[PDB]
Ligand binder design. Sequence first.
Ligand SMILES: [Zn+2]
Ligand SMILES: [Zn+2]
Lengths: 68, 104, 114, 914
Amino acid sequence: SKMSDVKCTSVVLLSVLQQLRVESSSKLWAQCVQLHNDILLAKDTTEAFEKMVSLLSVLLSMQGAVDI
Amino acid sequence: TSAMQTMLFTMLRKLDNDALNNIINNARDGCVPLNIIPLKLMVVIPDYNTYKNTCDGTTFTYASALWEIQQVVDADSKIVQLSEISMDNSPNLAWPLIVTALRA
Amino acid sequence: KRAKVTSAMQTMLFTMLRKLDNDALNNIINNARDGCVPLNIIPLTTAAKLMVVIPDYNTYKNTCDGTTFTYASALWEIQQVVDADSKIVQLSEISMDNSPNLAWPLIVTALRAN
Amino acid sequence: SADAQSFLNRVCGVSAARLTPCGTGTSTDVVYRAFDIYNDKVAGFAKFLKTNCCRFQEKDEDDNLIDSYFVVKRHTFSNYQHEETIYNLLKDCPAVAKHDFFKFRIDGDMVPHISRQRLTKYTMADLVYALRHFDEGNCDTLKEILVTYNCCDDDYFNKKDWYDFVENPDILRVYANLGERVRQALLKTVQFCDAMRNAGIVGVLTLDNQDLNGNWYDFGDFIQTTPGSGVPVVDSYYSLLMPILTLTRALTAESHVDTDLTKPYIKWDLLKYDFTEERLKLFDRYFKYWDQTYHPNCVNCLDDRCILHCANFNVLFSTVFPPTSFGPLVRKIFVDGVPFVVSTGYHFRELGVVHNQDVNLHSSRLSFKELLVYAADPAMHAASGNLLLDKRTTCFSVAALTNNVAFQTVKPGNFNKDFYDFAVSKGFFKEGSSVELKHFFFAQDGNAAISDYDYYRYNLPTMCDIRQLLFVVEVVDKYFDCYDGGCINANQVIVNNLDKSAGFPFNKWGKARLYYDSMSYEDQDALFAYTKRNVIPTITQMNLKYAISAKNRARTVAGVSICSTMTNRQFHQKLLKSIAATRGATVVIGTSKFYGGWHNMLKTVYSDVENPHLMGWDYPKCDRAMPNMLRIMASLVLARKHTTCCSLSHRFYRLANECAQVLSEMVMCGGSLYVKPGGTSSGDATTAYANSVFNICQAVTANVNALLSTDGNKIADKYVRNLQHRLYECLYRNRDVDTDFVNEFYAYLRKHFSMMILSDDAVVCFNSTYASQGLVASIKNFKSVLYYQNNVFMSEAKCWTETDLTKGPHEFCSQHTMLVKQGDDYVYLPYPDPSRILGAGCFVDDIVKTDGTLMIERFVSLAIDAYPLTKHPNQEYADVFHLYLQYIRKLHDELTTSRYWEPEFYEAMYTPHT
RNA sequence: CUGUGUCGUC
RNA sequence: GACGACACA
Ligand SMILES: [Zn+2]
Ligand SMILES: [Zn+2]
């Protein structure tokens, strides 16, 4: 049961990523969408975790939201 | 706007993974990765009181895996060797210090 | 409902006709056998500016090297090289070592060098 | 022994005395060489077992075997004398393997026999066969044709997927490496046909009588007459050879200085568009004897069959001329004394050069229809746009319109509304459940639309077999008899979704409603009359779509301009509405899976098949791969209903308009025009029915090549043998139409192959015993037809054969089928994938459509098609729909007999209306 | 984008 | 019939 919630949270992660006008670059958005796609197309619970934490590293590299 | 961020934070505090909360805590207390974690990582440490707990020598605990510094950078772009960190010569710099690590 | 769209099409035609009633086009149609030439040659022969899209460094190397390259059998002088972010890129920043630091698709624009 | 050595020194005679005893002194009768025979008993293009051959082999220098065999047979005196008496006439032209007739005594006494000279190992018939009837795990005489001719290496096949087209497209190069050989074959066949005419030899030319080195042999089916008059019947050879002339590109050397593959490409004149004299010279060089008047242009044809013939020739004849001369032609039309540059003609890759007729310089002003036809051409757009060189794709770039290319991103779909909290609450999405959410709204970066449009790179020039197409068309039109058609006026047309994209440039000022309301009825009809005499090229804006899928590929939908659809609707609405409004036929479009629809459809497919086993298929990249000749065939089959409304010239101009507008038009992907090589533009008005016509064409072609390529000497029936005889005869003989046999073959198909064809997705109910004896087609007969006609490869992992009847089609229209019980009335039910249903439920396209205001109607339309899950034996499948109904009731509550809280709604949508 | 079916007001 | 929605190609 730790794959459906992971895929859905990856979807909401890519959504909140684009919501910050991150789509205004080539490398960053290409890598982000590759992460999201390889999360969705995954079945393993660990690779999805690694790509999730990489997406979260992307989200925290900027300063749009830190400590609610 | 804030609804997506709220849902994301709730269902990140619902997954409850080790590396996930590790990254979230480090980003809460200042440690921000200057790039995307590859699978060569750079992190900023806005202080030193919350740094003694994470790195010690060539060992670096981050992303639930091991990292290893290769050279440390400071604000004025000097190579701070890792035995300079002490309780006396601390306020002689701007606290954001770039740590350049590597995988196993 | 009708006058508006008629005027739209008419002024659009007469506007793209400003950069179309030049002398190079009249020259190339004065050479045809019956005043009829294919369309695929009109820009290739009389358009006074080139736009080449470039996905990576290897195609750039052999398509737009130096400053004067020859496509469509003419000299082209390069100005305003830009990348996928609509960001100007100097000719020095396009190097093999720095190629992984800039956007992949470039847009090199040249002018017909007489 | 010594007899064998004498046999060797005697077969040698004048050639090299270093032959290898391949087989034995006796006839080695090597098995399974595909023949092309036609006599009073057997007919077809099949793979009979040879018995008379003895394929000796010479070895090259250094004791290395070489590709050269002497086929020593055991002929009789009669045919021996016949062959000698028709070979002494032809002993001078090059395309004659030196038969070298002689005698010996191979029985101990008095036995005659022949011994060939340097033909090949494998035959031209084997080349054509192994290229047509392609098997992914049986192509043994195709891993040798490609190897023994330096085209590729042996280890190229250990690479898995070596044979595919849509992946590993270097096989195109490995095949095209045979182009010079096939061109030498064409040349030699011409130097043979003319050598026969000029020497008086009347007879027939077949494929298995040539050889890859170009040589010919088996000169027995001829007969001698007064020299100077004899004509060879060369329909079969050219017809069966055609489909590989554009698979190996036998005309890749006419683009050179002296037609060799070393000199530089012809520096063609940029301002030359006619090419009709070069076309006549191409025909006089390669098909000097193809016995039917070939017109270089297609405007000088006689009927749709002449159009198919001439266009099928030109689709190969126009791979030589530069791609910078096709597309529209332009002229300096003056308006008020100001030079306009618009289209006064068109050069088609197949239909030749066609000129308009309502063209006139020195116009004082322009009207609405004139402004439309002007601003719709790519002429004024590509004449003033910056020259473009797009290195991201292969399609011929034309002219960037704006000053900077535009990238567009594909957003990710919403997720996790309260219909996931409830899904995880009500015992779903737990550890390894029977269902798992496996349908997402995937996302793509900026460089997606152009990399997806680049998938037209799989569309190739294809020269279909014309003597077979000119019969498949009749069978298809028989499949389309029960529909009425014909041109309709403006007032009689009906338009739905009047607020969609009106195409480029028309989308810069409004939707299609704007133009449809601005134009008057007289103006629309005059534009239609004008387009029935003039050719109008248009532009299709190809943009990305936003939908859910189980893959991560992008979906690019195209929108054609409005001046194209506005006329195509008047042209085709009658026939399309008639196809939609009829039930019980083959093409099932306009059906309704509700109210016993699925059950009645499946019964009609089970109509009266004797020993039934269902089937199914899918064409990979169907739209990106459909050849231009098959698209033109579909257009002509749809236009065949016009016989009392428009003359031949009107209908030809309508076909040319359709081609220039939807087949090979200007596509604006991004901010720059491109040349679309072919395929079906999604925004076409008639694409869902052109795909049906193409579907029936592929199925009938598979049936024809399964009934011909079967060994007629192994057909226990006494009627199928004669039906196959007359099938081959109506294919490659009798240039006219044979309504008798067309009717009888259509009846045979309807009785033993019950198709069910909604666009691009079909299900069949074939007689299993016949499809096992080879009397009809199977998946092994669809894969091959695809590989040599549509230029794709149909993997057997997406094709299902159901050996049972109780359980219905595994998947038709993405729905499953479960034979259910409705009160002692066992009927069929369409049920979908529960993963897809749960995905559609949880997610939503974009965040304005969260089910918060009045959007429960979104969730009712999911249980309307997810009801039969409740009747599945797996309890979780039923719990899918029960969870659906529970949360639909909770939605109805929090929002406070069409009440969607009780299941007495979905139960009614599957029992007949009354 | 082209259509096909199925639901909701006037 | 007008509008909106969902599903299939
Ligand atoms: Zn003709
Ligand atoms: Zn008509």
